[PDB]
Amino acid sequence: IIGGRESRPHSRPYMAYLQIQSPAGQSRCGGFLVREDFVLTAAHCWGSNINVTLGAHNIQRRENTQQHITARRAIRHPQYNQRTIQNDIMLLQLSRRVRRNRNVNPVALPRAQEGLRPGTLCTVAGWGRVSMRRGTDTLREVQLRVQRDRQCLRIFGSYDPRRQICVGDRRERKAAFKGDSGGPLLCNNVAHGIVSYGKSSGVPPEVFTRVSSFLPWIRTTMRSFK
Ligand SMILES: CC(=O)NCCc1c([C@@H](C2=C(O)[C@@](C)(c3ccccc3)OC2=O)c2ccccc2)[nH]c2cc(F)ccc12
Ligand SMILES: [Zn+2]
Ligand SMILES: [Zn+2]
């Protein structure tokens, strides 16, 4: 998170810290608990192994609030496209249910057909970088404004307003960045978006997955692999 602040510890108890292991080494993503057995995140965060840490604030320290659960399945949308980054959405079926408590509990999703309009102020949180090339170990958050479609259509290779949200005012140095992918865009305490990607410079606007568009996929998947 660029241009944000440290979150109050455990104030976002749905936040999931993901460590993604692959032949390229280790990478970081966020995610969010949507039921006691499922974390929602971005498909590009897939790797050979995905370890989930729930209940965290400082991910460089053991904390008694933490729960460590490996993903039993990492279920990517069937139309995820690595080149265009379309359909950048994935569900992690946890290998066991969380122990629900005030530090670990799920966040609401939009209702069916519930939209999200340009101009809405939302919050994004994560453990990603705080500048183009510096990181952090504690959870941070920043408020960003939903942009009109045109802002992202003009500057990205592939953008679809039906499935994506365009987020962040270009004049403000405030953005999700590397390490934040998969985390939620919270608008009035509902997770309407998933951090996907932006420019390598960190200059907004950036692209989020529009959760409301994928509710059928989310619901069916959660039922099948409950
Ligand atoms: C290819 C691309 O569009 N890069 C943009 C830089 C960027 C990324 C990139 C990215 C990761 O997410 C990460 C940490 C990674 C994690 C897990 C597995 C692989 C890689 O390392 C990366 O470099 C990225 C990579 C692939 C697909 C989408 C995004 N995440 C962001 C999020 C933001 F909020 C703003 C800008 C970006
Ligand atoms: Zn704590
Ligand atoms: Zn740990």
| Nearest ligand, measured from the Cα of 67 | 3
Q: Which residue is closest in CA terms to ligand 1's atom 33?
A: 177
Q: Tell me if 192 sits within 8 A of 209, measured CB to CB.
A: no
The residue whose two tokens read 């990607």 is: 197
- The minimum-distance atom of ligand 1 relative to the CA of 196 is 32
Q: Which residue is closest in CA terms to ligand 1's atom 18?
A: 45
Region of 117 (left: φ > 0; alpha: ψ -120 to 50; beta: rest) is beta
Experimental determination technique:
X-ray
Task: For residue 163, give every residue at least 6 positions away whose Cβ sits within 8 Å of its Cβ, in sequence order, or none.
Answer: 86, 87, 209, 210, 213, 214
Distance CA 11, CA 120 (A): 22
Distance CA 128, CA 41 (A): 14
Distance CA 41, CA 74 (A): 10
Q: What does the angle CA 94 – CA 98 – CA 102 come to, to the nearest 5 degrees?
A: 145
Distance CA 34, CA 165 (A): 20
- The minimum-distance atom of ligand 1 relative to the CA of 82 is 27
- Could you give all domains of the chain from N- to C-terminal order, each with its CATH number? 1-12+107-212 (2.40.10.10), 13-106+213-223 (2.40.10.10)
Region of 183 (left: φ > 0; alpha: ψ -120 to 50; beta: rest) is beta
Ligand 1, residues at Cβ distance < 6 Å:
20, 27-29, 44-45, 85, 176-181, 195, 197-198, 200, 206
Torsion (CA) 208, 173, 138, 199 in degrees, nearest 10: 40
Distance CA 184, CA 14 (A): 9
Span from the CA of 88 to the centroid of ligand 3 (angstroms): 26
Span from the CA of 123 to the centroid of ligand 2 (angstroms): 21
Span from the CA of 106 to the centroid of ligand 2 (angstroms): 18
- The minimum-distance atom of ligand 1 relative to the CA of 200 is 6
Record the resolution, in angstroms: 1.2
Distance CA 193, CA 122 (A): 10
Taking alpha carbons only, the member of 216, 208, 52 closest to residue 124 is 208
- Which residues are known to be catalytic? 44, 88, 181
Span from the CA of 139 to the centroid of ligand 3 (angstroms): 14
Q: Which residue is closest in CA terms to ligand 1's atom 3?
A: 197
Distance CA 72, CA 214 (A): 22
Residue 164 is encoded by which pair of tokens? 């994506």
Span from the CA of 42 to the centroid of ligand 2 (angstroms): 26
Distance CA 3, CA 33 (A): 25
| Nearest ligand, measured from the Cα of 68 | 3
